[PDB]
Design a protein around this ligand. Sequence first.
Ligand SMILES: *[C@@H]1O[C@H](CO)[C@@H](O[C@@H]2O[C@H](CO)[C@@H](O[C@@H]3O[C@H](CO[C@H]4O[C@H](CO)[C@@H](O)[C@H](O)[C@@H]4O)[C@@H](O)[C@H](O[C@H]4O[C@H](CO)[C@@H](O)[C@H](O)[C@@H]4O)[C@@H]3O)[C@H](O)[C@H]2NC(C)=O)[C@H](O)[C@H]1NC(C)=O
Ligand SMILES: *[C@@H]1O[C@H](CO)[C@@H](O[C@@H]2O[C@H](CO)[C@@H](O[C@@H]3O[C@H](CO[C@H]4O[C@H](CO)[C@@H](O)[C@H](O)[C@@H]4O)[C@@H](O)[C@H](O[C@H]4O[C@H](CO)[C@@H](O)[C@H](O)[C@@H]4O)[C@@H]3O)[C@H](O)[C@H]2NC(C)=O)[C@H](O)[C@H]1NC(C)=O
Ligand SMILES: *[C@@H]1O[C@H](CO)[C@@H](O[C@@H]2O[C@H](CO)[C@@H](O[C@@H]3O[C@H](CO)[C@@H](O[C@@H]4O[C@H](CO)[C@@H](O)[C@H](O)[C@H]4NC(C)=O)[C@H](O)[C@@H]3O)[C@H](O)[C@H]2NC(C)=O)[C@H](O)[C@H]1NC(C)=O
Ligand SMILES: *[C@@H]1O[C@H](CO)[C@@H](O[C@@H]2O[C@H](CO)[C@@H](O[C@@H]3O[C@H](CO)[C@@H](O)[C@H](O)[C@@H]3O)[C@H](O)[C@H]2NC(C)=O)[C@H](O)[C@H]1NC(C)=O
Ligand SMILES: *[C@@H]1O[C@H](CO)[C@@H](O[C@@H]2O[C@H](CO)[C@@H](O[C@@H]3O[C@H](CO)[C@@H](O)[C@H](O)[C@@H]3O)[C@H](O)[C@H]2NC(C)=O)[C@H](O)[C@H]1NC(C)=O
Ligand SMILES: *[C@@H]1O[C@H](CO)[C@@H](O[C@@H]2O[C@H](CO)[C@@H](O[C@@H]3O[C@H](CO)[C@@H](O)[C@H](O)[C@@H]3O)[C@H](O)[C@H]2NC(C)=O)[C@H](O)[C@H]1NC(C)=O
Ligand SMILES: *[C@@H]1O[C@H](CO)[C@@H](O[C@@H]2O[C@H](CO)[C@@H](O[C@@H]3O[C@H](CO)[C@@H](O)[C@H](O)[C@@H]3O)[C@H](O)[C@H]2NC(C)=O)[C@H](O)[C@H]1NC(C)=O
Ligand SMILES: *[C@@H]1O[C@H](CO)[C@@H](O[C@@H]2O[C@H](CO)[C@@H](O)[C@H](O)[C@H]2NC(C)=O)[C@H](O)[C@H]1NC(C)=O
Ligand SMILES: *[C@@H]1O[C@H](CO)[C@@H](O)[C@H](O)[C@H]1NC(C)=O
Ligand SMILES: *[C@@H]1O[C@H](CO)[C@@H](O)[C@H](O)[C@H]1NC(C)=O
Ligand SMILES: *[C@@H]1O[C@H](CO)[C@@H](O)[C@H](O)[C@H]1NC(C)=O
Lengths: 135, 135, 135, 461
Amino acid sequence: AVGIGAVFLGFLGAAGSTMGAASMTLTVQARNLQHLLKLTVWGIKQLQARVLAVERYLRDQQLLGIWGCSGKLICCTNVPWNSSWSNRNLSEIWDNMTWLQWDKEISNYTQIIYGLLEESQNQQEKNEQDLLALD
Amino acid sequence: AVGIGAVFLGFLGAAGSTMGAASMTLTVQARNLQHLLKLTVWGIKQLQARVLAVERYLRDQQLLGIWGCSGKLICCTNVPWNSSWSNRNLSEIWDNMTWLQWDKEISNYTQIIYGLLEESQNQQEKNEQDLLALD
Amino acid sequence: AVGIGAVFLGFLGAAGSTMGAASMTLTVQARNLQHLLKLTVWGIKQLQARVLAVERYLRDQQLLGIWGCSGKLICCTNVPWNSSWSNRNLSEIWDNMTWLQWDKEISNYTQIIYGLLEESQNQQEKNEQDLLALD
Amino acid sequence: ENLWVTVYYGVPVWKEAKTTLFCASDAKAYEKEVHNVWATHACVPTDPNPQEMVLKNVTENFNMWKNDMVDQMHEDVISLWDQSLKPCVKLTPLCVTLNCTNATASNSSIIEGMKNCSFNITTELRDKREKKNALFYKLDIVQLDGNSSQYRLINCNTSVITQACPKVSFDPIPIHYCAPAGYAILKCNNKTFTGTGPCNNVSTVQCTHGIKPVVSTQLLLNGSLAEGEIIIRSENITNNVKTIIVHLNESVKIECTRPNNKTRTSIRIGPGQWFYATGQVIGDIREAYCNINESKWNETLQRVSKKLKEYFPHKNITFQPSSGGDLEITTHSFNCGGEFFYCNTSSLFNRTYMANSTDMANSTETNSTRTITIHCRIKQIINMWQEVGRAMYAPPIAGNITCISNITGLLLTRDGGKNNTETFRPGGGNMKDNWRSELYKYKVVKIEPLGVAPTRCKRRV
Ligand SMILES: *[C@@H]1O[C@H](CO)[C@@H](O[C@@H]2O[C@H](CO)[C@@H](O[C@@H]3O[C@H](CO[C@H]4O[C@H](CO)[C@@H](O)[C@H](O)[C@@H]4O)[C@@H](O)[C@H](O[C@H]4O[C@H](CO)[C@@H](O)[C@H](O)[C@@H]4O)[C@@H]3O)[C@H](O)[C@H]2NC(C)=O)[C@H](O)[C@H]1NC(C)=O
Ligand SMILES: *[C@@H]1O[C@H](CO)[C@@H](O[C@@H]2O[C@H](CO)[C@@H](O[C@@H]3O[C@H](CO[C@H]4O[C@H](CO)[C@@H](O)[C@H](O)[C@@H]4O)[C@@H](O)[C@H](O[C@H]4O[C@H](CO)[C@@H](O)[C@H](O)[C@@H]4O)[C@@H]3O)[C@H](O)[C@H]2NC(C)=O)[C@H](O)[C@H]1NC(C)=O
Ligand SMILES: *[C@@H]1O[C@H](CO)[C@@H](O[C@@H]2O[C@H](CO)[C@@H](O[C@@H]3O[C@H](CO)[C@@H](O[C@@H]4O[C@H](CO)[C@@H](O)[C@H](O)[C@H]4NC(C)=O)[C@H](O)[C@@H]3O)[C@H](O)[C@H]2NC(C)=O)[C@H](O)[C@H]1NC(C)=O
Ligand SMILES: *[C@@H]1O[C@H](CO)[C@@H](O[C@@H]2O[C@H](CO)[C@@H](O[C@@H]3O[C@H](CO)[C@@H](O)[C@H](O)[C@@H]3O)[C@H](O)[C@H]2NC(C)=O)[C@H](O)[C@H]1NC(C)=O
Ligand SMILES: *[C@@H]1O[C@H](CO)[C@@H](O[C@@H]2O[C@H](CO)[C@@H](O[C@@H]3O[C@H](CO)[C@@H](O)[C@H](O)[C@@H]3O)[C@H](O)[C@H]2NC(C)=O)[C@H](O)[C@H]1NC(C)=O
Ligand SMILES: *[C@@H]1O[C@H](CO)[C@@H](O[C@@H]2O[C@H](CO)[C@@H](O[C@@H]3O[C@H](CO)[C@@H](O)[C@H](O)[C@@H]3O)[C@H](O)[C@H]2NC(C)=O)[C@H](O)[C@H]1NC(C)=O
Ligand SMILES: *[C@@H]1O[C@H](CO)[C@@H](O[C@@H]2O[C@H](CO)[C@@H](O[C@@H]3O[C@H](CO)[C@@H](O)[C@H](O)[C@@H]3O)[C@H](O)[C@H]2NC(C)=O)[C@H](O)[C@H]1NC(C)=O
Ligand SMILES: *[C@@H]1O[C@H](CO)[C@@H](O[C@@H]2O[C@H](CO)[C@@H](O)[C@H](O)[C@H]2NC(C)=O)[C@H](O)[C@H]1NC(C)=O
Ligand SMILES: *[C@@H]1O[C@H](CO)[C@@H](O)[C@H](O)[C@H]1NC(C)=O
Ligand SMILES: *[C@@H]1O[C@H](CO)[C@@H](O)[C@H](O)[C@H]1NC(C)=O
Ligand SMILES: *[C@@H]1O[C@H](CO)[C@@H](O)[C@H](O)[C@H]1NC(C)=O
């Protein structure tokens, strides 16, 4: 394919530009895409790492499937977000922080948010399914 | 990194016995996610299997795409269960049989069911042109 | 047994002669599914090959993903084609062209077309979500 | 107006994380010339390629004391000594006596207690055992029996008795650590090279450039040169006495070796074991006789008092010679791969420093050229690794050797720092703190490729 631009998958290079700006950069960063002896020994470890990267990427991709999202990079859901933890309002998020502070604004509640994404995705099938299950 | 559930993917072990509890909790059953020169060979051979297991997993993803169930974990389509399939009945399957039993019942019809899915998916695509063929 | 252009790229290396029926057959083709010391070195490059195939295939599927289709080995859009890149009658394309002719009578409009696909996709999925946005 | 949830993938974010890492290493410093050797083992050849992308507008937190890599490579590496634990010779697992007054060799040596000696109370008390003999210096004459002592083999009294025989290698190869996939290594830079708190010109790599082992009690050496002046590092520099380190512009040399010759008389001892009974008196007249280009030392202290004026205002300031205890605490340390040695930082380093509107009194000397000479000790029976019950009688090497070094930094402590003439000594620190050197440049992170935010877009149903 190509020589490594410092980072492989995850492709990190818009680092700490504005979150609002990052959405363009991100969508673009998608849109483009001993003689022989101990040096052949070494020739496993980086490949094993290449496989582990794929293992992580696929393991973590499966989660998006549970959230009902397909790598369609802007998946949205009528779980509300409802302000009261960092409260900033829209521009006051996306024009200020890096994502490398949005984590320090919010981690933790994440472990409930995954559940909101699960049970809401199950609701967005159930709440049609039960109206078909009238007969 | 992580342990094993029969296989490093697919994660058999929560067998559930009754298909009822197993299906009604299927989400959590994955959402929980010479000195040493011969260490070359003792990396190579399981690496081969490890890679080819991901290739097996991709065969599965191909079928799921073929049925229009990409990234889904429970899925359905148009096709009816049209009467002649064993009559074991909803209220008389899950509560009194196991996944291994259900295969040992159902093994006859597999390719036929798969073909019925294939046909129905391919029809469901063009059926929308009954409304949308305005030009 | 499994389909083969490469070990799973291009699900038959041999083309079905004709951009009509061969396209339908491809979906069904996807549906049907010393000596030792330097030999432990020979066991590298085929590994690299299988890994590269996965790498390419996933980059490819990501481009389909941003275009708002996945799996779907044929997929439809809402992008127009304004009657001016060869205009060969559609049966005559299907019946008289291989893709290895559309490769020459058409092609290198590709970048523009990829643009149209992406831009339309994003703008469309925003339209519905914008029409839904009011509260 | 209202909001809803949305999720993104490829989001630029990471978090700091403990992990193992895997190592690149020199491609030829080991080869088929060294079968099964521990330096030949495990970690891979060298990578020429470490790229970067800039953190434009973007900065990150660091703390060299907190970082786990010190443990990561304090682990792995010491297993060389675990591989080196060869068995005791049949003659000496017990505390044998030895008999001599002058040497068994043709003379006792020109300097100190080198009075070589036979084993005598030796298992069977038999010629096959008592004919065998050892090189002497110092700890080897320790008292056993009464007056007119038959001297103690001291190595018996500790949990491991062993020798790392001369086939073993100790070459300080540059390792080049790289983090596993999805982890990444971040490199701090600015002229403000402090190594804790925020950092501005922070930078990205797949792997570090080469960094090398070192084995010093007081003066760090033979490695990573500084960026263009001198600097000091501490956990909490406000502290009374907790360990301080100093990093140097210009590698001042140490100009000496101890070339006192003893011949290659190794023996296939006892039941077919091996021992290194080096004898004869050709080249016996020789000593360490150590020297330094004084001005190239003097510059550091005379600058350092200004640096210390920023940390401890207006006071007269002082160094004194190194703290007491064993010779090791009393000294700077090395072995060439030939003899274990310990120079007198407990005589040297004795200077006061004026710090008013000063133009005087900050040095050893001023305006002479001249250089200096210094004197230093040897210890041939060693608690070979500190903080373990392991000890060795060292195997010697003939003639002069290709050895000398130059100094990258000081290991330091602020002993007595509650009164004017504000006081310091060379030495202190964990044995670990050798490996603080350069590692202040780095931290290790794990990538987290997805995240969640509010939006105006209400999803389809
Ligand atoms: C570590 O290693 C470095 C590099 O080997 C050593 O040298 C540094 O070298 C630079 C360049 O020569 C030194 O900077 C120079 O300092 C001179 C003295 O400055 C004092 O006196 C002047 C009047 O002469 C005062 O104005 C000033 O405030 C100071 O009190 C200056 O004479 C030099 O001026 C030149 O540069 C300027 C700036 O670009 C030009 O405009 C002028 O025309 C002129 O050409 C110059 O600034 C520097 O001092 C050295 N660094 C240090 C920290 O010493 C180090 O010496 C060595 N050791 C240490 C401890 O770092
Ligand atoms: C700091 O960095 C310096 C510079 O690299 C190191 O000193 C060099 O060390 C290497 C490796 O030993 C020397 O190169 C080779 O040494 C062999 C002799 O080994 C003895 O010396 C080492 C210590 O250096 C002992 O550990 C060991 O037990 C042995 O007693 C020679 O056989 C090699 O010979 C080849 O080169 C010579 C010319 O040098 C030719 O005449 C020969 O024909 C042959 O081609 C080789 O010399 C190197 O010489 C050392 N240089 C200096 C300036 O000392 C330090 O070890 C390192 N560490 C510290 C803490 O300072
Ligand atoms: C303390 O020990 C360290 C480590 O041994 C010493 O570090 C550095 O040592 C070198 C060589 O003694 C000094 O001299 C310069 O070295 C470079 C690199 O060799 C030379 O540049 C070019 O290098 C290539 C490849 O080697 C060569 O083909 C070229 O011919 C050569 N020259 C040119 C013009 O291209 C350069 O000419 C110098 O010879 C370094 O100065 C020194 N490092 C630093 C940062 O100073 C260190 O010298 C030593 N100090 C003391 C007092 O003992
Ligand atoms: C995310 O969750 C944690 C709690 O799980 C939030 O608080 C952090 O919790 C740790 C452990 O309790 C705190 O450390 C401890 O603090 C006490 C009191 O200062 C000290 O005595 C202990 O020795 C220990 O250091 C930590 O300080 C605390 N952090 C903060 C900033 O409050 C955390 O705040 C949550 N994240 C956010 C952004 O809300
Ligand atoms: C499809 O299901 C059948 C039954 O579960 C699987 O076994 C085969 O079944 C037939 C019909 O019973 C057997 O033929 C004959 O059946 C009569 C009545 O049972 C019996 O008296 C005869 O002796 C004879 O068995 C057939 O022999 C049997 N096959 C075997 C190897 O025992 C069949 O294998 C399933 N096929 C698939 C693809 O799932
Ligand atoms: C890509 O689309 C262009 C039209 O947009 C197709 O034609 C272009 O035609 C000119 C004139 O023939 C090419 O210039 C030169 O022509 C001579 C003679 O044919 C040839 O020897 C030169 O090597 C050069 O091709 C022009 O390059 C060509 N454009 C491109 C990008 O090839 C063209 O047929 C389409 N090509 C493909 C590969 O789809
Ligand atoms: C200890 O180190 C000092 C400082 O390096 C040595 O003294 C002086 O060193 C400088 C270079 O740093 C010498 O300068 C050179 O002199 C020649 C003419 O002799 C000239 O052509 C060059 O352009 C350069 O200026 C200087 O001569 C030297 N002075 C003296 C009196 O030695 C000192 O030699 C070192 N001593 C030892 C034993 O290491
Ligand atoms: C030279 O080395 C000796 C060790 O062989 C140093 O020994 C002691 O060191 C401490 C710390 O400096 C002093 O408090 C002791 O008084 C020293 N004891 C003796 C017997 O000297 C010694 O300090 C060094 N020589 C000099 C002159 O300082
Ligand atoms: C949203 O509502 C929950 C309760 O449903 C509340 O705990 C939380 O603080 C609110 N704010 C955010 C940003 O989640
Ligand atoms: C469904 O209909 C087919 C004919 O279309 C018939 O052969 C079959 O027995 C029916 N039942 C099932 C469950 O396939
Ligand atoms: C469509 O028209 C545009 C100009 O509007 C032209 O560039 C393009 O070549 C035409 N062809 C097709 C099939 O879109």
